[PDB]
Amino acid sequence: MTIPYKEQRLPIEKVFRDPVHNYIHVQHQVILDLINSAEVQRLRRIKQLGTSSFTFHGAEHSRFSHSLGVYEITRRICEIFQRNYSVERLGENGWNDDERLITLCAALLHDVGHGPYSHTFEHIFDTNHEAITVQIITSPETEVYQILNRVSADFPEKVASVITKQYPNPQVVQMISSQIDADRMDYLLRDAYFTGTEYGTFDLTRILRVIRPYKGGIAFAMNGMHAVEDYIVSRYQMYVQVYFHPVSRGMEVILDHLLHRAKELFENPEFDYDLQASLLVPFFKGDFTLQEYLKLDDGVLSTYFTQWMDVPDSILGDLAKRFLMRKPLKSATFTNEKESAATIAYLRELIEKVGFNPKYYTAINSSLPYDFYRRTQIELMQKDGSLVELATVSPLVAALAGQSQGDERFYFPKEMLDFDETYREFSSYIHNGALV
Numbered sequence: 146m147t148i149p150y151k152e153q154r155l156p157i158e159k160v161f162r163d164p165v166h167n168y169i170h171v172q173h174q175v176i177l178d179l180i181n182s183a184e185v186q187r188l189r190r191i192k193q194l195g196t197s198s199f200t201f202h203g204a205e206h207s208r209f210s211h212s213l214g215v216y217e218i219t220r221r222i223c224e225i226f227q228r229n230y231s232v233e234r235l236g237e238n239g240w241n242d243d244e245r246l247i248t249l250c251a252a253l254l255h256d257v258g259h260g261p262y263s264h265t266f267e268h269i270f271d272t273n274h275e276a277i278t279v280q281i282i283t284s285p286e287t288e289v290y291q292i293l294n295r296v297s298a299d300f301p302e303k304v305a306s307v308i309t310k311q312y313p314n315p316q317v318v319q320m321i322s323s324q325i326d327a328d329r330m331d332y333l334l335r336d337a338y339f340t341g342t343e344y345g346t347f348d349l350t351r352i353l354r355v356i357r358p359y360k361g362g363i364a365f366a367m368n369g370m371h372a373v374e375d376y377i378v379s380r381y382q383m384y385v386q387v388y389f390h391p392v393s394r395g396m397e398v399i400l401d402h403l404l405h406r407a408k409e410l411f412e413n414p415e416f417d418y419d420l421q422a423s424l425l426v427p428f429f430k431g432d433f434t435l436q437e438y439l440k441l442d443d444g445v446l447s448t449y450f451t452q453w454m455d456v457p458d459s460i461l462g463d464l465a466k467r468f469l470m471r472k473p474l475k476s477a478t479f480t481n482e483k484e485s486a487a488t489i490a491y492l493r494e495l496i497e498k499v500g501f502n503p504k505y506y507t508a509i510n511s512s513l514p515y516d517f518y519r520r521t522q523i524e525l526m527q528k529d530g531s532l533v534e535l536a537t538v539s540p541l542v543a544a545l546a547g548q549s550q551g552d553e554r555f556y557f558p559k560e561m562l563d564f565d566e567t568y569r570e571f572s573s574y575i576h577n578g579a580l581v
């Protein structure tokens with residue numbers, strides 16, 4: 146006729162079953178094609194909770210299922226915006242539905258650049274998922290780009306501009322990235338379910354009941370303050386029980402140390418014949434291609450780690466064992482970085498005498514909460530027209546904003562708390578997961 150690619154609908158609404166949202170609804174051809182693109186399909190083979198998933202049994206949900214979730218919350222929000230908060234009846238403070246497609250695409254593609262065990266992988270190799278996401282969307286060698294380009298020649302650039310917070314419409318940008326966006330709302334609910342963290346679940350329906358657009362972006366009806374508060378508390382709960390949880394952090398250290406060791410053996414003339422990890426080679430060399438990056442996923446790396454147990458290097462072989470047996474390093478807390486630097490260095494010698502290289506079996510670690518402007522880093526609430534920020538009306542949120550925790554952890558093998566005179570000497574400086 147021809148119906149433009151923008152407006153193409155499915156004969157019948159496609160659906161995806163979901164434990165968090167019940168059903169993911171797909172009705173645009175573009176969205177379906179985006180979902181079926183190699184780039185987005187790759188996310189099925191990548192765990193949302195990287196190393197942290199090994200902390201809770203069964204929490205191996207993929208980044209793909211999270212992406213669909215953000216997409217789903219987003220369309221629920223756009224549907225709410227059109228039915229009762231359009232430009233047609235609110236003017237400048239209204240929502241333009243012509244923005245529906247782009248926000249849906251950005252929602253779904255917001256995490257395409259992640260890669261396996263993203264956070265840890267991101268440190269060892271100089272990669273950046275936010276930039277790769279934008280790269281995937283804007284470079285022609287991608288199925289995502291080819292799909293977007295069919296919407297309009299300038300569409301790939303515009304979708305990318307939403308992700309980088311440069312898109313001219315704030316309502317679109319904040320729906321995908323703010324202090325209370327579709328992205329955050331999804332992973333908090335999704336990670337809460339899979340890890341079984343009961344206190345991590347908040348009521349999404351209440352928040353959706355009060356969500357609203359306005360001139361400068363996205364606001365929430367004043368009366369829904371406590372529903373927003375419940376979201377803040379749930380965010381706090383996920384942070385302490387799941388994200389900054391000690392044993393999940395002990396898992397990141399092991400993976401970090403495993404990859405470090407792998408890279409050092411590779412750069413060394415004769416320390417490891419050939420570790421057979423062809424897909425990691427371009428990364429060890431520091432000369433990687435986009436296509437080479439897209440070939441990587443959790444399954445690919447797990448295969449290599451399993452193979453590294455045979456590698457004639459005690460350190461590498463032992464770390465791969467500890468990673469696959471899902472046993473992280475144990476830890477203890479401390480406040481003084483300089484005053485307790487003597488105690489740390491001392492018990493590091495004790496770890497050597499036993500047979501553990503402190504560079505690989507020890508670590509010092511420390512750590513994003515809600516804090517009003519010092520902007521777009523605040524959630525706003527509408528009274529009778531005007532806008533006020535959350536911490537100004539919520540003593541609870543104001544309390545958690547000023548609460549900053551300088552948590553400092555010291556890692557070591559669990560086997561230190563089990564020729565036995567040294568173990569007795571070591572455990573003497575640790576009482577209830579804290580230094581003495």
Ligand SMILES: [Cl-]
Pocket residue numbers: 194195196197262263264265266397
């Ligand atoms: Cl990770």
Ligand SMILES: [Zn+2]
Pocket residue numbers: 211215255256328332
């Ligand atoms: Zn996300």
